[PDB]
Amino acid sequence: MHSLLIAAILGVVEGLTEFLPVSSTGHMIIVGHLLGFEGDTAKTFEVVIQLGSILAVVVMFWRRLFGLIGIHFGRPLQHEGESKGRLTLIHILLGMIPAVVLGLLFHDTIKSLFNPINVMYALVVGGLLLIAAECLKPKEPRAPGLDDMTYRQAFMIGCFQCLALWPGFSRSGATISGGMLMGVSRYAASEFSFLLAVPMMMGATALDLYKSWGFLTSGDIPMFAVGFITAFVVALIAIKTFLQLIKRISFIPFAIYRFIVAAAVYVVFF
Amino acid sequence: MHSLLIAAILGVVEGLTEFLPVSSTGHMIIVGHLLGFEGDTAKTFEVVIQLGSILAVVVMFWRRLFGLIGIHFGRPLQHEGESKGRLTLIHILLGMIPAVVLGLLFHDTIKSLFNPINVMYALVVGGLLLIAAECLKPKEPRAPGLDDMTYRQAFMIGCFQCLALWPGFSRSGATISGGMLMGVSRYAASEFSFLLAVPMMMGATALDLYKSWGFLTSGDIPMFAVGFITAFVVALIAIKTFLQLIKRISFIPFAIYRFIVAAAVYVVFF
Ligand SMILES: CCCCCCCC/C=C/CCCCCCCC(=O)OC[C@H](O)CO
Ligand SMILES: CCCCCCCC/C=C/CCCCCCCC(=O)OC[C@H](O)CO
Ligand SMILES: CCCCCCCC/C=C/CCCCCCCC(=O)OC[C@H](O)CO
Ligand SMILES: CCCCCCCC/C=C/CCCCCCCC(=O)OC[C@H](O)CO
Ligand SMILES: CCCCCCCC/C=C\CCCCCCCC(=O)OC[C@H](O)CO
Ligand SMILES: CCCCCCCC/C=C\CCCCCCCC(=O)OC[C@H](O)CO
Ligand SMILES: CCCCCCCC/C=C\CCCCCCCC(=O)OC[C@H](O)CO
Numbered sequence: 001m002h003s004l005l006i007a008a009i010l011g012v013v014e015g016l017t018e019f020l021p022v023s024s025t026g027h028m029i030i031v032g033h034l035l036g037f038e039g040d041t042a043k044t045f046e047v048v049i050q051l052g053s054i055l056a057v058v059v060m061f062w063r064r065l066f067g068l069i070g071i072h073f074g075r076p077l078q079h080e081g082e083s084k085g086r087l088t089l090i091h092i093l094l095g096m097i098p099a100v101v102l103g104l105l106f107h108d109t110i111k112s113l114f115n116p117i118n119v120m121y122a123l124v125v126g127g128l129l130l131i132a133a134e135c136l137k138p139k140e141p142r143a144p145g146l147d148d149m150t151y152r153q154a155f156m157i158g159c160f161q162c163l164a165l166w167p168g169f170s171r172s173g174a175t176i177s178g179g180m181l182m183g184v185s186r187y188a189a190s191e192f193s194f195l196l197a198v199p200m201m202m203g204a205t206a207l208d209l210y211k212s213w214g215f216l217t218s219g220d221i222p223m224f225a226v227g228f229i230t231a232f233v234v235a236l237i238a239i240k241t242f243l244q245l246i247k248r249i250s251f252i253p254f255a256i257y258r259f260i261v262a263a264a265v266y267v268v269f270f
Numbered sequence: 271m272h273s274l275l276i277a278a279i280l281g282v283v284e285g286l287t288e289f290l291p292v293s294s295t296g297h298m299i300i301v302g303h304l305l306g307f308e309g310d311t312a313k314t315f316e317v318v319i320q321l322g323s324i325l326a327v328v329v330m331f332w333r334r335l336f337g338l339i340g341i342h343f344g345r346p347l348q349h350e351g352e353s354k355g356r357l358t359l360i361h362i363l364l365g366m367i368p369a370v371v372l373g374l375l376f377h378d379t380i381k382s383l384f385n386p387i388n389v390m391y392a393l394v395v396g397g398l399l400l401i402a403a404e405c406l407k408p409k410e411p412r413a414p415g416l417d418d419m420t421y422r423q424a425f426m427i428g429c430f431q432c433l434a435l436w437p438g439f440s441r442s443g444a445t446i447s448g449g450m451l452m453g454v455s456r457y458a459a460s461e462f463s464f465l466l467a468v469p470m471m472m473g474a475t476a477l478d479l480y481k482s483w484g485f486l487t488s489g490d491i492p493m494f495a496v497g498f499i500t501a502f503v504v505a506l507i508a509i510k511t512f513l514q515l516i517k518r519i520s521f522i523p524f525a526i527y528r529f530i531v532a533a534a535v536y537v538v539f540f
């Protein structure tokens with residue numbers, strides 16, 4: 001029973017935590033274990049609802065995303081920055097390259113890192129990195145807006161995205177931290193993290209969906225639909241609220257909260 | 271036979287490759303396999319001769335290293351930089367923290383990465399990172415000299431040192447690349463890499479020597495002495511020559527050479 005209610009709860013958790021630097025995997029294993037929804041169907045379910053959150057970024061950054069791949073039909077794209085530069089597809093590619101290289105080489109080792117004890121450590125270490133980024137970032141951002149970003153900043157963020165190969169570390173936490181440490185403002189680094197997440201997660205989800213295509217032909221459709229659609233709406237709200245929120249608060253509260261989630265992981269599983 | 275001659279050959283290889291961004295582990299497994307010197311005694315031997323190369327940095331950077339820990343008795347230390355700043359022990363600590371955290375957590379996974387196929391990949395990827403650092407570094411260094419380095423640069427270099435946990439990647443390659451990508455000059459980033467190597471390798475060697483303390487009581491003394499002493503002299507020459515060399519050449523030749531070493535690893539073992 002409550003198959004649709006469980007789908008909506010996980011969809012809310014996915015939509016809130018996928019793009020905030022608080023680790024969706026950590027929250028998924030907790031709530032999934034509390035709701036008794038574990039196993040291959042649950043893991044396949046949580047891969048499907050990730051597409052819902054991806055679509056939220058695609059919808060929110062529609063004009064810029066199609067602009068990046070060379071499709072522009074009408075109104076000029078809003079300029080986000082103090083300089084006359086423009087984010088390009090090269091920025092995105094440099095942001096992808098490091099994690100794509102290491103992810104394919106270390107595929108088998110990453111698969112064995114989904115133990116709750118490894119996730120708990122990744123939550124804490126990811127939280128420590130956010131704090132370090134807040135302590136060490138330059139006083140004056142080098143890239144105030146998304147369109148001020150340089151190839152060097154983008155590649156360095158890509159290098160930090162390799163830390164996200166550690167389950168629980170949070171891709172948004174790793175890339176936002178790297179961006180701030182490269183002098184990208186909190187706002188711009190969050191945006192670039194969201195844009196970078198689209199090609200990274202679509203390829204990763206397509207690889208996960210291909211290898212776990214085994215499910216009920218039509219029985220999982222009601223659950224998968226409700227979860228997918230909920231994650232989309234909540235991610236729309238969360239991203240919009242986060243970008244407005246991060247303009248006047250730091251990542252310290254998110255780092256402290258990750259320490260609480262790590263403690264939650266321990267008590268739930270041990 | 272040729273126990274002293276084999277010790278000197280490996281000592282030369284250790285002293286040349288330990289602090290150049292060309293991976294000593296890659297060269298050790300090649301030459302060790304060609305000389306038929308493999309096994310627990312050989313692995314213990316190659317840990318001992320690393321102390322010889324460490325001592326070379328200690329001798330070459332004697333005044334600065336003791337200065338960093340607060341021991342200064344007489345002539346003021348030479349100022350290396352355009353600003354009025356000074357490298358401090360905090361720079362060193364920030365350079366150590368990331369690799370120390372991840373190295374202790376991922377200890378068991380790192381132990382299983384010494385397969386020649388993993389070393390070959392690390393040689394290539396490390397070579398690609400050197401090229402990227404050469405392509406993406408700022409036109410004007412932010413830290414021309416060692417004493418111009420900031421806490422942010424030091425911590426970021428520490429983050430890149432985590433890549434060195436991959437056997438074959440080369441600690442010097444990872445940290446020099448990170449430094450150049452943070453706007454530290456080639457010369458200063460090499461120096462900081464050497465200084466950072468002293469606490470990192472002394473702790474790592476002490477952990478390796480403790481767990482492999484099993485050897486011939488006095489039979490290995492002649493081999494271990496000749497190797498240790500050779501690695502010291504060659505590292506003295508190599509470091510001095512490298513620092514003079516890097517002032518007018520880039521790391522491109524070192525990156526190309528790593529690709530040749532990766533091919534050598536394949537042909538020797540496969
Ligand atoms: C990265 C390139 C995108 C590739 C994947 C394409 C999306 C996949 C299919 C979606 C069907 C639903 C289409 C819904 C279209 C919404 C467009 C929109 O709402 O844009 C509004 C405004 O421009 C912004 O706020
Ligand atoms: C276009 C080609 C794309 C190829 C893609 C290959 C990338 C390698 C795998 C990455 C996911 C596996 C890492 C596991 C991360 C889960 C832990 C986590 O929660 O981080 C996510 C966070 O919610 C977000 O902010
Ligand atoms: C990082 C702090 C160092 C801790 C570990 C200490 C070294 C270990 C013992 C060495 C015995 C041999 C001592 C040899 C002393 C050489 C000093 C020297 O030659 O310095 C010359 C000049 O100051 C520079 O070029
Ligand atoms: C003070 C406490 C210190 C604690 C120390 C814990 C560090 C973790 C282990 C690091 C070595 C294992 C990584 C294996 C690297 C071998 C591959 C290689 O060749 O890189 C070296 C290169 O020669 C150089 O430039
Ligand atoms: C950790 C694993 C990483 C291994 C993967 C490495 C692959 C090579 C990547 C990029 C090549 C370098 C691209 C250089 C782009 C040129 C940019 C430039 O020249 O300057 C920037 C511009 O002037 C201001 O925005
Ligand atoms: C939503 C976005 C998803 C997009 C996913 C990324 C797809 C990669 C696209 C192009 C790079 C193709 C690889 C070949 C690299 C060529 C880059 C290059 O040539 O840059 C030099 C520049 O043209 C100086 O004139
Ligand atoms: C049986 C299982 C019951 C599960 C019940 C699910 C309903 C949770 C709803 C909202 C809380 C969302 C929790 C995650 C909120 C994001 C974390 C966060 O952002 O905290 C940082 C801080 O707010 C920076 O200001």
Ligand SMILES: CCCCCCCC/C=C\CCCCCCCC(=O)OC[C@H](O)CO
Nearest residue numbers: 125128129132135136367368371420421422
């Ligand atoms: C990848 C694993 C990493 C996890 C480990 C993270 C541990 C926290 C590290 C450092 C705390 C921050 C130290 C902040 C030092 C203050 C520096 C500063 O405030 O500015 C610099 C100075 O003004 C100009 O040189």
Ligand SMILES: CCCCCCCC/C=C\CCCCCCCC(=O)OC[C@H](O)CO
Nearest residue numbers: 335336338339359360362363366465468469
């Ligand atoms: C060859 C060198 C090898 C040395 C190996 C490193 C040993 C660590 C030393 C001190 C840090 C001790 C950890 C405690 C961190 C305190 C740092 C701190 O307080 O910095 C603030 C500063 O004092 C603002 O006033």
Ligand SMILES: CCCCCCCC/C=C\CCCCCCCC(=O)OC[C@H](O)CO
Nearest residue numbers: 279282283286290292301304305523524527
């Ligand atoms: C049976 C085994 C026989 C083994 C014979 C051992 C004697 C090798 C002596 C010198 C070559 C040293 C090789 C490593 C040299 C460093 C690599 C390097 O620096 O190349 C980069 C380029 O020079 C940038 O200008």
